[PDB]
Write a protein that binds this ligand. Structure first.
Ligand SMILES: [Mg+2]
Lengths: 1341, 96, 552
């Protein structure tokens, strides 16, 4: 049941829940995206196809010439990834596009038979993604983080007053396109409606309607409801719709001419409305007083005269009513202005609206958008059309269109990118509805409204930008010149497209150096989703609201992993099982519950879809492949958690882990930690530095196997077989015949990367863990990465801690460590760094790399080559010369005393400087390799060419295996065909392999096949020859360099870094500390048996910080090492196999109701012995998050190993021998060594280099700068009376030039006096102000 | 030439096409570049600018100033011990 | 200026000046040439615009952008901002003779000392060393002195040890909120690369030893040295200037040690012996013949300050414990015995120091503060106090309280559907119920925890305060509080939705029992809200204090 790397060491886990899904491939979010950008998709519009089909074909102005798109192709990259890194060049592929130019005929309307000229064009470089999800830009590993931005569409928000006595709720609506300008509607505090285009300035909202060729009557038609008054020669009568009367005090009596219904004074009830409704009342003879107050809809002209008696939208008057009666109009269509349930907002906006017709409205918009220009007809027309309705200037991507329609309760999902006028009017409709109280306001933080962009989509966008930039030049050139002579590749300039793409990849805010501290940081960097970046929210713009944890984050983003400080809540990490649907919204899996029975169908549900159902919890007690044990379950629905019956549940969570990210899922006892400390622990695991010897965690969670394998840092078997030869640098493996492909020989080579440098200057090294002759299957580990044990993630090392106060050496978070930890070389790290010496050619002459260097004794020149480069393997310390370089010095006129001195002693004083490269002060290491780059014209030194010779030897060595492994397959096919036309069993085998071609059988097809195979061997030879010549040419040819650079030398230096007081250490539960002292072994507290404790921590850090993970982990670690010691003692008694089998199996099946069943009987004796060997150091345990090992189980495990169940021991003092008065907690905890080393942080400065314009000392350890004495510190000295130290800090220490040199020369003489002056910074200020034409000057006295 | 060959042209091939000697082309390539602004933000965060990063070269070191003063004093002491006419001759000759 | 790579670096004023000159020259050319008027009007406007962009960019509406993308920075920009001359180069500037590194606790130090690494000290005090190498004749010239130092000969270390003696240095930790953030210490040379800081001054600095760093400055002149010694030395700053209370206040381990040493217990070794003063008490305890907690009768001589400052001596036979007798040997003479004769907490120790200050002076309090620290560390270590998981006891009747509250809320919710209860009524009632249940659980837990030890007093049973380690950390005021222990052993309580509303069902589990998925997700809301509050509150605090400092 177990793979071999598992039978090597099975890790016991305590999980009770049975898992349904497997953890998916972790990096998929990256890889999948990029594939869509390159995948050659015929109909599916993704990436390059979509961009080309968007722009091409490009129509010339006259319509006689056009450029046509055919297809594209990605060329083979010229340099491989390793070569790209060593040469500092981008890993990329050439993009080659087939274009077709078509020239029409003037005479015939569209005669396309004049010229069709088709050819390939080179159109820029495209960087490629390595199979691990990273790009190599300029020789460095970069990662592009996904971005989380607000999806296109419509959003109806409210800003409830936020400043008013009224406290009015103000409603606005925004339309956001994918590409285009913004359109915004809103209410004025006086219930008037306003429009903003691109957030410039308000206009009354009806101008948009007028610009759309709508007449005032038509506006009033589409928004409002009409009301009908009949006139009968004296009578004013209204057509009555009963429910229109709701919510109004009675004005008069309303009889339906038969019987009184509403008496004056009666409040109108629902019963009155119902009576009217059943009575079928239609017409009421209303008093003439009533219509005094209403508003007219249509334009009532006098039919006798044709003049406007009253136009639309005027309040009616009694005399106006009379004139309408006399004009012959029986019909009056007034307006339905019924208060709050309906609103008169459109009418009021019309009344404020100044513009009258379409053209004036366009003029208004035009002079709002482009103020100060005359508004001609055509200009306004073109501006409006291009503004909102033109294909190339506005786009609601299919995402935006779907979101739009679904916000408006439409049916269709697909639509045009441009806005139709129905869309605008519907948006206005819904905004008004919200104002009257029908609809609801959207929530902007909902993960149904926020969408993620991955690298494929941003790259595609930038490529489209570049293509559009090409469009201009192509289309103009298509028009002017003669169309006959030119070919398409002359029309296109490659430079702009590659400019856009390479600028995005190299300079964008989302392209970042990859974190190579260890595998976990790598994974968690490839998986972050960032809210910042182009087209996204920024720091200051971000309030408290966007930064919090929303109820829809459940199972989509981690709640407890996000940076502290300013970026909190803006950068956050994708959870474990989450993925994205085709539109780009996060979604998570669920188990479907059929009619009470929990099935195994997985459905992925999005954010908006999830809230509809009722979802159970992950830990609800299921029953024997059936329905729930409990009658009543705990569930969540519509964002609220509550209790439900069995019958009402629809879905169930997949596993307990699916809430948290990866980094948090690696913490052992998460469910006992306060969230503040779990956050810190998650952030701190990513900074661990990988030590010399990897060590598995005795207390894990089981996600380590997945992280280690998926991070891509190990070497994983590709198809499986048997190991044939293992080296420290190579593994070759014969393939099983089952998966051996029928053409080839079955040999796979894995080359291991050894001692290369990471971005953070740590060591990268792979070690083989398989042994010669062992059998392996597909997918199991052959080599260990930097910080991986036998297949598992192992960030740090696990130590004997005691929780007690020492003599104040662990005061506040400090840590006391034993000398054994230093002796054992635990926590020793290896750091690799670059050093570079560049020789240029100056105006006085070229510098040169030589060992003949002035003013240097032979002691220093001891370690240099003949050519002036260091020998490989020489041990150097601070100040030593690594490469000797001298520059041509000018003429130096010295003051008389040097003339006298040289005259006395006869010093020649040659004209050349000493600009050699030397080791930085403090650094001390070994030189592991040297690399030399020469310009094309310069001769090669001796050193460089012996390096080249060594490289040639290596290349010939390597290429021979590649040749032989291929002859072997070809000869396999020859022997598989020659025995089929006559079997010669031992004859061919015993005679030489080679001269089988000089043998021939009956003139059947066998002879023809034998011949045609013989003509394969001849070009396998040419394969070898051309490839060898390619390698010969690559390393002989001169490297291209920056202009003016003659040659470059790089030296790689390896430093072994040991632990010391000042370094920072931490555990997984958020507990930090700096090493405070290193005790001798005698002084450390010791056990009954004499084993001393390795680290001492402080009790006072648990109760207030309140993370109890530490203590439970310590007890469980003590138990695990206890079982390890039983195994070890049993092994030292030199054997007894049945007893090992028995004890190990009872230990494995200890747990209460664990799911892991390990049958040990099936193991053969050798595998049992090997397993015992690996468990000798302790039983590795696995307690998943929220499915933990609970306390009673820990106590049972402690009993099995013969340890105290309370977890505390009698402990003695190593220094006086007296027992400590109380039992103390002892056990094993997994500690980490973080990347904040005291070596990198110590710094001091007496005097050094000073800045240029200001004349103050520089800043930073690199420049040997001084610490800043900021404003606050000045206030501090002001608060004392310390005036003299202040005047020191301000004048003679930084700016006062004469002052500072004088005071140096004083304190050399033992004087200690000030003699201050005037800071240069003030003189600079004074000149700056004078340059403004303002005369500022010092008044004397 | 780039679109014809499908890659960037080496200066030798470019020199062949322009009918000019290699050194002339190299000289033009190095002359071409235009100066860089002192306010370019070199730090990822827009707090530190290239300008703060540049060192002043004109200044001498307090160490060398003290050394020069000591040298002058020592030379004066040694010269004073020499014969009067010899001392004044040496001063007169070297401009000490 | 020429950059090393052959490129050139320039300031923007060069560009702005160039275009002003260009427009001016072309205007002169135009006027000399008798052009039409629209052209000269154009030139005149462009000249005026160029001058405006020179003097203040962007105030004329549209800022002239450089070659890249960004606006050119002009003269007014060089003066104004947070990064103009005034705040960045005149009011505060970078400084010579200074260094920086990680801090670490040194408990053996005296209150006026700090540990300085050898390498930092060698670098900071460079010229002083050159001077005394020349004085003793060990080096003829300054260059010889350089070569002597760079090769680190032994005489260099002897000279350095002679230089730093009596020379104070200034230690700073940013942000410097108040005037106690800079203090002067006397250095002790150590090996290693971390600065060692005295434990008692951490409160003033607000420093904790988990990766912090501090900066070191060197005062040079005689006046600077003297006012570092007189105004700024750490032994001069024991009271705060905001309010009068002391700042040297013993803390976590010191308080735990003194609490454990002073507390008393029933019959344990050595009841009712009679002792000839504290020295016999120590001789008994360290020989294993008596316990720190024995209730014993000891003969004690106090001193008391007379009318005219004389110290009258008074001798008596007191009832105390072994621990208190041993502690009494530290206390300077002049204070009453009643100070030591009760189980000391944090408040008691701080009051002890304050009394010693206002009676005896400064020097006795400095020495006394040190000795308190030393004794507290020693006896805290000898106690061997630790933290296991069995130390967080849970009331035997928690589940009963929870079940009763659940059933009662169930009945109120059932009663709701009869229409007798509106939404507001039900919500308020349920919250009240859960609050009452929380209080009952918490009180039961404290009752079971605080005074739970039953001891035989040579016969029948007796009841005393407990020696549970978490309870010790609670009472002593060392680190814990009541709310934290409530979370560890009671219920975690009620939580609030993102903004205002308080969720209906509380969290019934505690950290010993472990939360489940949903409860953890609920707590994350408040966690992140508080954390973001602090992160974005620091800036407002800083801006306020800057305005206040500038006004007055
Ligand atoms: Mg801290």
């Amino acid at each position: 049941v177990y793979s071999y790397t598992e039978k090597k060491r099975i890790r016991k886990d305590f999980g009770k829940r049975p898992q349904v899904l497997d953890v998916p491939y972790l990096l998929s979010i990256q890889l999948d995206s990029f594939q869509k950008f390159i995948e050659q998709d015929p109909e599916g519009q993704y990436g390059l196809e979509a961009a080309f089909r968007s722009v091409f074909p490009i129509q010339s102005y006259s319509g006689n010439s056009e450029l046509q798109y055919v297809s594209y192709r990605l060329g083979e990259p010229v340099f491989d990834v390793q070569e790209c890194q060593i040469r500092g060049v981008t890993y990329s592929a050439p993009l080659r596009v087939k274009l077709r130019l078509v020239i029409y005929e003037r005479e015939a309307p569209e005669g396309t038979v004049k010229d069709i000229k088709e050819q390939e064009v080179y159109m820029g470089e495209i960087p490629l993604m390595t199979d691990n999800g990273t790009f190599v830009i300029n020789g460095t590993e970069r990662v592009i983080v996904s971005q989380l931005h607000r999806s296109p569409g419509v959003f109806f928000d409210s800003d409830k007053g936020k400043t008013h006595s009224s406290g009015k709720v103000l409603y606005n609506a925004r339309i956001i396109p994918y590409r285009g300008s913004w359109l915004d509607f809103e209410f004025d505090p006086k219930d008037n409606l306003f429009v903003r285009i691109d957030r410039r300035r308000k206009l009354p909202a009806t101008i948009i309607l007028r610009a759309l060729n709508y007449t005032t009557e038509q506006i009033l038609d589409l928004f409002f409801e009409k009301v009908i008054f009949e006139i009968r020669d004296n009578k004013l009568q209204m057509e009555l719709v009963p429910e229109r009367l709701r919510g109004e005090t009675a004005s008069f009596d309303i009889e339906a001419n038969g019987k009184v219904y509403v008496e004056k004074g009666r409040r109108i009830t629902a019963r009155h409305i119902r009576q009217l409704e059943k009575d079928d009342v239609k017409l009421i003879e209303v008093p003439v007083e009533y219509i005094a107050g209403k508003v007219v809809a249509k334009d009532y002209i006098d039919e006798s005269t044709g003049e406007l008696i009253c136009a639309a939208n005027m309040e009616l008057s009694l005399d106006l009513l009379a004139k309408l009666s006399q004009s012959g109009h029986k019909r009056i269509e007034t307006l339905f202005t019924n208060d709050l349930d309906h609103g008169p907002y459109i009418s009021e906006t019309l009344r404020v609206d100044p513009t009258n017709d379409r053209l004036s409205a366009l003029v208004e918009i035009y002079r709002m958008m482009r103020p100060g220009e005359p508004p001609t007809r055509e200009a306004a027309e073109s501006l409006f059309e291009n503004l909102f309705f033109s294909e190339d200037r506005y786009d609601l991507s299919a995402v935006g269109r779907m979101k739009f329609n679904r916000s408006l309760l439409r049916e269709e999902i697909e639509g045009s990118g441009i806005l139709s006028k129905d869309d605008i009017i519907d948006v206005m409709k819904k905004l008004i509805d919200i104002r009257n109280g029908k609809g609801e306001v959207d929530d902007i933080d909902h993960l149904g409204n926020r969408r993620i962009r991955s690298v494929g989509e941003m790259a595609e966008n930038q490529f489209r930008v570049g293509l559009v930039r090409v469009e201009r030049a192509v289309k103009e050139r298509l028009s002017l010149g003669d169309l006959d002579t030119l070919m398409p590749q002359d029309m296109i300039n490659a430079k702009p497209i590659s400019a856009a793409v390479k600028e995005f990849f190299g300079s964008s805010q989302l392209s970042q150096f990859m974190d190579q501290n260890n595998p976990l940081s790598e994974i968690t960097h490839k998986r972050r989703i960032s809210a910042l970046g182009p087209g996204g929210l920024t720091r200051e713009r971000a309030g408290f609201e966007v930064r919090d944890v929303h109820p829809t984050h459940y199972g989509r983003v981690c709640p407890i992993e996000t940076p502290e400080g300013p970026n909190i809540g803006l950068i956050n990490s994708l959870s474990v099982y989450a993925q994205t649907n085709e539109y780009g919204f996060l979604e998570t899996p669920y188990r479907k519950v059929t009619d009470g029975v929990v099935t195994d169908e997985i459905h992925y549900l999005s954010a908006i879809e999830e809230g509809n159902y009722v979802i159970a919890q992950a830990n609800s007690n299921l029953d024997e492949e059936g329905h729930f044990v409990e009658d009543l379950v705990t569930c969540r629905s519509k964002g609220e958690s509550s209790l439900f019956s069995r019958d009402q549940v629809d879905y169930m969570d997949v596993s307990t882990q699916q809430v948290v990210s990866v980094g948090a899922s690696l913490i052992p006892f998460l469910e006992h930690d306060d969230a503040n400390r779990a956050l810190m622990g998650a952030n701190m695991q990513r900074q661990a530095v990988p030590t010399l010897r990897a060590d598995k965690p005795l207390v894990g969670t089981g996600m380590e196997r997945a992280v280690a394998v998926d991070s891509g840092v190990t070497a994983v078997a590709k198809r499986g077989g048997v190991v044939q030869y293992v080296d420290a640098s190579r593994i070759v493996i014969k393939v099983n015949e089952d998966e051996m492909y029928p053409g080839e020989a079955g040999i796979d080579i894995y080359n291991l990367t050894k001692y290369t440098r990471s971005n953070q200057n740590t060591c990268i090294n792979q070690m083989p863990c398989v042994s010669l002759g062992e059998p392996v299957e597909r997918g199991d580990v052959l080599a260990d990465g930097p910080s991986t044990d036998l297949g598992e993630l192992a960030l740090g090392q696990n130590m004997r801690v005691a929780f007690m106060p020492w003599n104040g050496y662990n005061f506040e978070d400090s840590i006391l460590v034993s000398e054994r930890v230093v002796q054992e070389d635990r926590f020793t790290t290896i750091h690799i760094q670059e050093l570079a010496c560049v020789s240029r050619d100056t105006k006085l002459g070229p510098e040169e790399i030589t060992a003949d260097i002035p003013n240097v004794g032979e002691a220093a020149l001891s370690k240099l080559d003949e050519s002036g480069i260091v020998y490989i393997g020489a041990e150097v310390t601070g100040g030593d010369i690594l490469v000797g370089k001298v520059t041509p010095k000018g003429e130096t006129q010295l003051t008389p005393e040097e003339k006298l001195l040289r005259a006395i002693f006869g010093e020649k004083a040659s004209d050349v400087k000493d600009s050699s490269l030397r080791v930085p002060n403090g650094v001390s290491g070994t030189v592991i390799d040297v690399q030399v780059f020469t310009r094309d014209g310069v001769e090669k030194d001796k050193r460089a060419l012996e390096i080249e010779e060594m490289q040639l030897k290596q290349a010939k060595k390597d290429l021979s295996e590649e040749l032989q492994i291929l002859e072997a397959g070809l000869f396999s096919r020859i022997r598989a065909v020659l025995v089929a036309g006559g079997v010669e069993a031992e004859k061919l085998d015993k005679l030489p392999r080679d001269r089988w071609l000089e043998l021939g059988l009956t003139d059947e097809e066998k002879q023809n096949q034998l011949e045609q195979l013989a003509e394969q061997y001849d070009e396998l030879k040419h394969e070898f020859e051309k490839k060898l010549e390619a390698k010969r040419r690559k390393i002989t040819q001169g490297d291209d360099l920056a202009p003016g650079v003659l040659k470059i030398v790089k030296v790689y230096l390896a430093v072994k870094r040991r632990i010391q007081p000042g370094d920072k250490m931490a555990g997984r539960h958020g507990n930090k500390g700096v090493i405070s002292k290193i005790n001798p072994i005698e002084d450390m507290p010791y056990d009954e048996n004499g084993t001393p404790v390795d680290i001492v921590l402080n009790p006072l850090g648990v109760p207030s910080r309140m993370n109890i993970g530490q203590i439970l982990e310590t007890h469980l670690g003590m138990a695990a090492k206890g079982i390890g010691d039983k195994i070890n003692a049993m092994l030292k008694q030199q054997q007894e196999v049945a007893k090992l089998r028995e004890f190990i199996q009872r230990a494995y099946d200890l747990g209460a109701d664990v799911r892991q069943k390990v049958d040990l009987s099936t193991f053969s004796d050798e595998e049992v012995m090997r397993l015992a060997e690996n468990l000798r150091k302790g039983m590795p345990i696995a307690t998943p998050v929220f499915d933990g090992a609970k306390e009673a189980e820990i106590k049972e495990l402690l009993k099995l190993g013969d340890l105290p169940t309370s977890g505390q021991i009698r402990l003695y003092d190593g220094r006086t021998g007296e027992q400590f008065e109380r039992p103390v907690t002892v056990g094993y905890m997994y500690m980490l060594k973080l990347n904040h080393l005291v070596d990198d942080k110590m710094h001091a400065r007496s005097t050094g280099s000073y800045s240029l314009v200001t004349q103050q000392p520089l800043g930073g350890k690199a420049q040997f700068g001084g610490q800043r004495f900021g404003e606050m510190e000045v206030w501090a000295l002001e608060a004392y009376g310390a005036a003299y130290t202040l005047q020191e800090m301000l004048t003679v220490k930084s700016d006062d030039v004469n002052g500072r040199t004088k005071m140096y020369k004083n304190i050399v003489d033992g004087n200690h006096q000030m003699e201050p002056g005037m800071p240069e910074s003030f003189n600079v200020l004074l000149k700056e102000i004078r340059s403004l034409g303002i005369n500022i000057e010092l008044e004397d006295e | 030439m780039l679109q014809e060959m499908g890659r960037e042209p080496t200066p030798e091939e470019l020199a062949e096409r322009m009918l000019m000697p290699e050194d002339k082309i190299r000289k033009v390539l190095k002359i071409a570049k235009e100066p860089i602004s002192m306010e370019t933000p070199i730090g990822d965060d827009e707090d530190s600018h290239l300008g703060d990063f540049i060192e002043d070269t004109t200044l001498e070191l307090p160490l060398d100033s003290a050394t020069t003063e000591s040298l002058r004093a020592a030379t004066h002491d040694v010269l004073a011990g020499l014969t009067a006419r010899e001392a004044k001759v040496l001063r007169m000759r070297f401009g000490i | 200026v020429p950059l090393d790579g052959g490129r050139f670096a320039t300031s923007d004023l060069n560009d702005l000046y160039r275009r002003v000159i260009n427009r001016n020259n072309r205007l002169k050319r135009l006027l000399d040439l008798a052009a039409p008027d629209i052209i000269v009007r154009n030139e005149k406007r462009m000249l005026q615009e160029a001058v405006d962009a020179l003097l203040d960019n962007g105030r004329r509406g549209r800022a002239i952008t450089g070659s890249n993308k960004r606006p050119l920075k002009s003269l007014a920009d060089m003066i104004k901002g947070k990064q103009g001359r005034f705040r960045q180069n005149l009011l505060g500037k970078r400084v010579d003779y200074s260094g920086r590194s990680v801090i670490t606790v040194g408990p053996y130090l005296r209150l006026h000392q700090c540990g300085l690494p050898k390498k930092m000290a060698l670098e900071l005090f460079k010229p002083f060393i050159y001077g005394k190498l020349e004085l003793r004749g060990l080096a003829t010239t300054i260059k010889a002195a350089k070569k002597m130092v760079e090769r680190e000969e032994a005489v260099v270390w002897d000279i350095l040890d002679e230089v730093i003696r009596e020379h104070p240095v200034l230690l700073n930790r940013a942000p410097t909120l108040h005037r106690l953030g800079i203090q002067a210490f006397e250095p002790v040379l150590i090996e290693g690369k971390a600065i060692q800081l005295h434990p008692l001054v951490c409160a003033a600095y607000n420093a904790d030893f988990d990766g912090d760093q501090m900066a070191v400055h060197v005062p040079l002149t005689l006046e600077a040295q003297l006012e570092a010694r007189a105004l700024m030395m750490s032994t001069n700053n024991i009271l705060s200037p905001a309010n009068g209370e002391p700042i040297i206040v013993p803390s976590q381990d010191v308080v735990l040690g003194l609490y454990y040493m002073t507390r008393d217990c029933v019959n344990a070794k050595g009841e009712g012996m009679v002792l000839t003063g504290p020295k016999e008490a120590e001789r008994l305890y360290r020989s294993g013949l008596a316990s720190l907690h024995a209730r014993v009768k000891v003969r004690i001589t106090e001193y008391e300050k007379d009318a005219n400052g004389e110290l009258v001596a008074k001798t008596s036979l007191k009832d105390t414990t072994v621990g208190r007798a041993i502690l009494w040997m530290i206390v300077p003479k002049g204070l009453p015995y009643s100070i030591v004769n009760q189980a000391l907490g944090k408040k008691a120790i701080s009051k002890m120091l304050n009394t010693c200050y206002r009676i005896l002076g400064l020097k006795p309090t400095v020495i006394f503060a040190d000795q308190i620290m030393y004794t507290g560390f020693a006896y805290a270590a000898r106690s061997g106090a630790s933290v296991g998981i069995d130390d967080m006891v849970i009331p035997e009747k928690k589940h009963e309280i929870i079940s009763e509250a659940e059933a009662e809320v169930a009945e109120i919710q059932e009663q709701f559907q009869s229409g007798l209860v509106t939404a507001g009524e039900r919500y308020n009632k349920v919250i009240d119920i859960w609050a009452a249940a929380n209080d009952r659980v918490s009180k039961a837990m404290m009752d079971n925890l605080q005074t739970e030890t039953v001891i035989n007093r040579d016969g029948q049973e007796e009841k005393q305060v407990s020696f549970n380690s978490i309870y010790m950390m609670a009472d002593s005021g060392a680190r814990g509080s009541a709310a934290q222990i409530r979370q560890l052993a009671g219920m975690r309580g009620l939580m609030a939705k993102p903004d205002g509303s308080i969720i209906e069902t509380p969290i019934t589990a505690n950290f010993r029992e472990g939360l489940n998925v949903l409860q953890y997700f609920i707590s994350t809301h408040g966690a992140r809200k508080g954390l973001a509050d602090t992160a974005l509150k620091t800036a407002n605090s800083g801006y306020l204090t800057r305005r206040l400092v500038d006004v007055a």
